[model samples]
Target chain A: GAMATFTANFKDTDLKSFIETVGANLNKTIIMGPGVQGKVSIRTMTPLNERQYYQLFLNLLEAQGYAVVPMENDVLKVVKS
Target chain B: GAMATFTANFKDTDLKSFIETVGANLNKTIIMGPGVQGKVSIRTMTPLNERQYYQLFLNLLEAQGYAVVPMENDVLKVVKS
Candidate 1:
């Protein structure tokens, strides 16, 4: 009765590149704080876009023990949570 | 280019009714703890179903300063967070 809307598969991709890609699509400047380091491999079974994707990013980051905080000037900062 | 999936609206509804309605739809028994008492009013711009609805329920509860915890026998108990 349903199917996946979209899919983003990144296997063993570095964190910097991953954040940059999602950030660019969101048109938001994202800064990675010095406290965080690692790889992020995520595959959205049924990809959601925009606010949905942003919420998905929040879930993914929190699951991996990280945080994305909002900053001034409509920017965001990712740090170790 | 985008549209809302569904919508749910209730004006100043009681917690018990709100909980029961969503619970019945999910086919999950939900009990209200002795501590929580209030009215709930909600309107979804775009209605989400099933798991999405459940997650929405969670956010709604927490926003209203409450918590839903899983108890034994697959039952859920709503209480203070």
Candidate 2:
């Protein structure tokens, strides 16, 4: 079977807001805090499957100096590394 | 950058149920239905990063003849391939 793909962009927004958008887009719940502050800019080539998109997103966040932890209850916590 | 990793196991479970467990473990909401029926057995060689784990899991579901669609609102839909 062929893999499905998609592209989304979030430019110049704090981690929390960006995550809010992403969570909204994916219809998933994501929680983060001390309410950290940082901006993000992402542009994907063509499209990628859900996993691939997430891989890239995580790497991008990492490069920007953040850690994402997936926790129970569909909560993804982002923190400074 | 060094990637963090972890491992988990889910054996003999339905698609909806397995996804529920995964969603719970990851703290992410996964909406799937029409209620498909299938049993999954997964054993990873070692711990994997979030991205790697998701990639492997997606591939495994694909191998089991399921299609995964990531929709806006963080809802992941799985269906017959």
Candidate 1, Cα interface RMSD: 9.1
Best model number under TM-score: 2
How well is each residue in B53-78 modelled by candidate 2, as lDDT tens digits?
Answer: 67876898789888888888766777
lDDT of 2 at B14: 58
Measured against the true two-chain complex, the DockQ scores of the candidates, in the order shown, are: 0.05, 0.04
Kindly list the per-residue Cα lDDT of model 1 for residues B1-81, writing each as its tens digit.
Answer: 222232457789888778876665555688888877889988877656456767888889999999888778767788878
| Residue-by-residue lDDT tens digits, candidate 2, A1-81 | 112244776677776787777666555677666646777777876565455556676797788777778776766777776
Please list all clashing residue pairs in model 1, or write none if there are none: B6-B47
lDDT (CA) for every model shown?
A: 0.72, 0.67
